[PDB]
């Protein structure tokens, strides 16, 4: 009750992930440094703007 | 292998160290350096009339011999470094076993 | 050059005697082997103290550091 | 378990338990036992609570000073039963604790000592120590 079969029928990315990951970490690192730097203001902010 | 490691195992052990100068030492090993420099506490020391000393550090080369307790398990303490070296050193058909 | 190591290698499998620095002990026996650091192994060893036979020791190991000299007998 | 002639102490034979209700009093007791038992070369260490003894040190030790709760929980566990059998000497300090609601733990421990070990069946020495009490 079983049919016969035919053999003819069958017949860098990781580095990029690690890289984009490194750029994500570094960018978040620069951003975090910016947050640390951010961590009177009305008149000074008016003078800047 | 290195017996000094076997000495390193000997912390908190009460021992009597005979020394090359003939001095007898009795105390609990706090540590032994790899130099076999032995630091001990609660030490009675007899120079060739005992002096009682809180802590004594002995330079390894001066140690003649160290007499260990008879209760110590030498079979267990001797085999370490070989196992550590083995640990440092360390397909279809996988299951010989079935269901 | 004839080095102490080759002379000693040729001395293996021969009856030898070794005078230690103390001179308190000399050992006469067949020279079985010697290692690179020059420790000595003798067989059928005999001990001569003060030039007289103390006794027959047998298979014996001599710490290198004690050896004053070795001579062939 | 220790010969008068041969001065080697037999470590693996006897085991000792001292039931002191409080951690602090356990501590005090332990220093006392160390002071008095130092000449035989005995390890007197605490089994209870902040003591934090593991599976091994119990085997290594000879004299134990425990609080009732932690001793109950140690002897309740099925794997250690060898240690429980090894203990010859069960000391109960302040048996008058039975009045208070921790005392239930002591009587449970007592019941376990008599009734629970019948397969080895050698009953340890039990010493109660208490303030003077009626009945």
């Amino acid at each position: 009750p079983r049919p016969l079969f035919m053999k003819k029928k069958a017949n860098d990315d990781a580095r990029v992930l690690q890289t984009k990951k490194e750029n994500m970490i570094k960018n978040i690192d620069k951003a975090n440094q910016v947050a640390k730097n951010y961590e009177n203001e009305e008149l000074i902010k008016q003078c800047l703007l | 292998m290195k017996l000094v490691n076997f000495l390193k195992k000997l912390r908190n052990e009460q021992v009597t160290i005979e020394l090359k100068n003939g001095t007898t030492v009795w105390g609990t090993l706090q540590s032994v350096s790899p130099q076999m420099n032995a630091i001990l506490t609660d030490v009675k020391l007899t120079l060739p009339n005992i002096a009682s000393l809180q802590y004594i550090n002995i330079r390894g080369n001066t140690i003649r011999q160290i007499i260990l307790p008879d209760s110590l398990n030498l079979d267990s303490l001797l085999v370490d470094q070989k196992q550590l070296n083995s640990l440092r050193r360390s397909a279809n058909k996988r299951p010989r076993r079935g269901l | 050059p004839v080095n102490p190591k080759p002379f000693l290698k040729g001395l293996v499998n021969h009856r030898v005697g070794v005078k230690l620095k103390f001179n308190s002990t000399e050992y006469r026996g067949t020279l079985v082997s010697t290692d690179n650091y020059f420790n000595l192994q003798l067989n059928e060893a005999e001990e001569f103290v003060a030039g007289v036979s103390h006794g027959t020791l047998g298979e014996i190991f001599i710490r290198c550091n004690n050896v004053l000299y070795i001579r062939e007998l | 378990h220790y010969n008068p002639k041969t001065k080697k102490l037999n470590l693996s034979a006897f085991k000792i338990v001292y039931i002191a209700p409080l951690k602090a009093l356990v501590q005090e007791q332990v220093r006392e036992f160390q002071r008095r038992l130092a000449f035989l070369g005995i390890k007197v260490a605490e089994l209870t609570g902040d003591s934090r003894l593991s599976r091994k040190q119990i085997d290594e030790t000879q004299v134990l000073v425990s609080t009732p709760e932690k001793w109950d929980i140690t002897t309740r566990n099925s794997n250690n039963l060898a240690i429980v059998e090894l203990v010859r000497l069960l000391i109960i300090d302040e048996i008058h604790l039975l009045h208070d609601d921790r005392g239930p733990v002591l009587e449970s421990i007592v019941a376990r000592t008599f009734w629970a070990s019948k397969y080895g069946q050698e009953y340890p020495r039990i010493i109660g120590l208490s303030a003077t009490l009626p009945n």
Partner: protein, 39 residues
């Protein structure tokens, strides 16, 4: 390779006496520098 050579040299050298001692569990006598002997 170096480890192998060291173990082998140890085996066929004068060290063979103390190696043979450990394997056979045989007694040996050691003349020491203290003028004491250990059997």
């Amino acid at each position: 390779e170096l480890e192998e050579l060291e173990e082998f040299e140890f085996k066929h050298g004068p060290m063979s006496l103390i190696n043979d001692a450990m394997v056979t569990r045989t007694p040996v006598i050691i003349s020491l520098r203290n003028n004491h002997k250990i059997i």
